[PDB]
Amino acid sequence: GKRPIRLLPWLQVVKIGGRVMDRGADAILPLVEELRKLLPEHRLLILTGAGVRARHVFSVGLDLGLPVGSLAPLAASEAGQNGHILAAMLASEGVSYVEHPTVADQLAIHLSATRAVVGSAFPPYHHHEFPGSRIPPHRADTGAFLLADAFGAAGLTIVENVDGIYTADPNGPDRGQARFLPETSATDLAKSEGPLPVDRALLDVMATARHIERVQVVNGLVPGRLTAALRGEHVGTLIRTGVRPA
């Protein structure tokens, strides 16, 4: 479709939910062991989300009246911290955390040096976050997708603390009526109201995407799901972005 070239067609991008990291060692150690075993199989950019500490900083910032552009970098910092924690656990395998400018400009050389690098999933919108909601809309799912698609990566897998997307929050008030969605499209999700385990802005950037045709959301609390998802096995919710092949 005359689309832009893929910059890193061999790259697999993996976004790790900040609420997975927030579970601490019980979740992180099995995830690290699974990532270790994946290093020889894939060339990975592992991007971390923010999780509960961003909620706390939002609670303070909103109480101080701060605008959405003030809150964005404050949440981004939490995703960075999670990336530093994860990279520390993988340091002995040669993995380090890299900052945004390095991800933006020097990822190819870093993935030549080593099999995986970790970075923040939040995009550097910061004080130029868009207005409208008091909650920064371009968060970790959105940033990871923007990067994956800009690079023309072989995939983006979103690793969450739930099996995938349900028809309602499976940890919420309406938990009883939450039905699992094995497959959905971004456009179908965009026209539903209600919470999701992914940013709403992710659906918007899926609409303008040029390369990534599907993103799978999988439960990183179940060993082996991330491995399976990276081989294309259907083990969580597939989201079709509406990109079609050339």
Binding site: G65, P67, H100, H127, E129, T208
Partner: protein, 268 residues
Amino acid sequence: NSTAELEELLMQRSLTDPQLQAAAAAAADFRILPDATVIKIGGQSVIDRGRAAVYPLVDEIVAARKNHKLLIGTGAGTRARHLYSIAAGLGLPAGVLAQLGSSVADQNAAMLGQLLAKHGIPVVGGAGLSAVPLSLAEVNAVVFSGMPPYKLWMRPAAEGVIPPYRTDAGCFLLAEQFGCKQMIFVKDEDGLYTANPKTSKDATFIPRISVDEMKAKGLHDSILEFPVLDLLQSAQHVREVQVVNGLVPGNLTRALAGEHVGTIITAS
């Protein structure tokens, strides 16, 4: 809608939850720099034209900062168009073009800053903001590069690889984020017309219009292009902008004095 209810929702729901979103919308609204005006000095429309356009505006800025706190952002212009042409021709995506354009807006800010240095006015880069210069009567202004920082994470347009959020958007978002009182875009036409005034010897001048009206009139005069107009409709703090001709002696000075030169574009 207390702190407590908001904090509970923040802890227990996804940020996408409509209930949390609604509770956050009820938060207090602090304006960080409410007494500043953000001005964008056009790249193609002003700086690329050299001394004849830039020197009078430098004099205006110097005069104006006596009465008005200014955040002065720069456009990119012809060199960015050149970069975008080369990169688009190679099949590079919008995120790559976005970094290229940032460099050109930075060159323009450096040039403008060098003309303003002896007047005490700095070029700033992290916090465009810059709290110290903005607070001094001797200073009361700063220059910054207008491109947003999105780089590789730039949202693409629906079609094509030209970054949609460029220096008008970058300056607008700074005004919006800092809660500034006024946003003035300084370009090379008197304002908005019913047609592009360079390619039509018939366009009618529009002193005031809303974004909805521009869309409904099917306006294509992209003195301000749509991405920044959509941002304007979503804005919390800056709900109208003014477009003025920087090539007219004193137009900036007059707009800062509350004169209705140019075109006022309102969110609603």
